[PDB]
Amino acid sequence: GMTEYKLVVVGAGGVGKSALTIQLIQNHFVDEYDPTIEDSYRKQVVIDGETCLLDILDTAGQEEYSAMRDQYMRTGEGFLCVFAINNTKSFEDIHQYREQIKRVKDSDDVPMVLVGNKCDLAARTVESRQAQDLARSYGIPYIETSAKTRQGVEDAFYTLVREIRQH
């Protein structure tokens, strides 16, 4: 039947990365979650008139298991590389995440999107223009998201699915 896309979320820990998938998969309109529930990470969606199933792997909290990253990454067809807009170190980490994905997938052209996540009201330290320039140097889209209002969340995942479809 419908196509299933295996998406993988990667990025620095401790800076709200998990809010992206929680807000997507959530009962959009009731602020609640049980991650232990079978298929709290699967969602049927319609993108450009075509119904598909998203299977999202977000191992948030396991960042210290650094030698497991290759195995987790190999499961994915497309990747969201996430940094926090108030944490410059998480932005500087993006280059090495992208290089690791390219190595694991053995491809110089892996579907991926750069996501700048606003996880609190602390002062932004990565400007939009810096992140746009980085994304353009890689040839990938840039999406900014809010961890509180759900803004940008659908755009991040749907943009990635379009990158897979157009690969």
Partner: protein, 469 residues
Amino acid sequence: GQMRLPSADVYRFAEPDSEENIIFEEGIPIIKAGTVIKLIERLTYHMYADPNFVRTFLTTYRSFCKPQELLSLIIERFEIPEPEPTEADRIAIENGDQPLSAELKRFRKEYIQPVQLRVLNVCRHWVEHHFYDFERDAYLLQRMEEFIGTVRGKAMKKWVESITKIIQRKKIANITFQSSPPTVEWHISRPGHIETFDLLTLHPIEIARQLTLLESDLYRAVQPSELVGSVWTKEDKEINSPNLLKMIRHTTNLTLWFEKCIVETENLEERVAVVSRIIEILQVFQELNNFNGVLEVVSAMNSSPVYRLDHTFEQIPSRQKKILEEAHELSEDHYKKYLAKLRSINPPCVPFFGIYLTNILKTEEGNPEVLKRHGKELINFSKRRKVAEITGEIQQYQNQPYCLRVESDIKRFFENLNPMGNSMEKEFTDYLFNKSLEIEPRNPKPLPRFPKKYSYPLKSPGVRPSNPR
């Protein structure tokens, strides 16, 4: 009829339940949300005990109440006023007779004594299982000692004297088995010859046993204080989650050691022997229910440097391919088969901790701290119950010890393993990948030959145990 209660003006815990102060889930009730006063009332309720709720509350309360404030509130809960004499008592006294005091005696027996005992049970559990609050705040400990040491009256005396002693023991602070542990197994390396210890010279059975003892001890040392509030992900993680981080760093180091053993063995035949030996260690991990160990091996086999070694895995015996495949399948579909296997085996076991960490973090991040109802903010207790269900599962697998004997030299060998040396992570993992490219170049580059590096026999002794008399 029900017992009458003190006036809510003199005793705050007698206010009636309403949706403005407590909400229940849809046979004791399960609380969805409430004020801190209502949570403490139900924590120490006169009609029933709720040991699960005591554990849940003491594990998670610091997200909504400070330790000093909790102690003040349970002391307030303990100090219950007694009712005045009734009309029948008054009339007896006016005649020079002793009153029956029926209502007073019932209130003592059915309200005061159960509530007071349940307050003491909170204190006992707090000191026995969550003593870190008192290690980190000496004044909190002084207040607890003073409270317990000044409870009067004979109904509580046995437990007050006991709790006083328990506190004093905790301030200055042995296994028996159904059988004997199996005999320690040796291969090329002999007892005391630590300088020859290595992947292929120790017995693969004993490698798996000693790593299982080490990894079990690391698993058992992690306390809930290292998990609640997602503190292992935050800036102070080294302060707040040291046992968890030590456990994860061991797992990472062993995975990297497996990868390094493989790719630094440049001769193809020798490298096949190395990979085959690691799969035998994985087989013994499976037999021991050491799932952390199983996934350490699987992670190494699916790493970028090892996964691409097609010439090596082509020569692995088909049965070992099947062992590795069924271990890999445990992690597929979001660990579906792993979760089912963990819930089916007979402990002792060593769980993989990573799934617990992701579920605690997402439960914290995906649920609100408070629920707003009728203009009031109620503590969202359902969210805390979900976190404590996970910490309770962790603790359940921490109880059962392995019936295996420690070998101090093999233990020390694996404790001191340091495959990265002084290199930084990126440096080292790039080195491993470049070694992989050296020993099995990308097509269409030809496969080179390399000299042997091991002077001893490569034949495995196998993983079925031996038993002399």
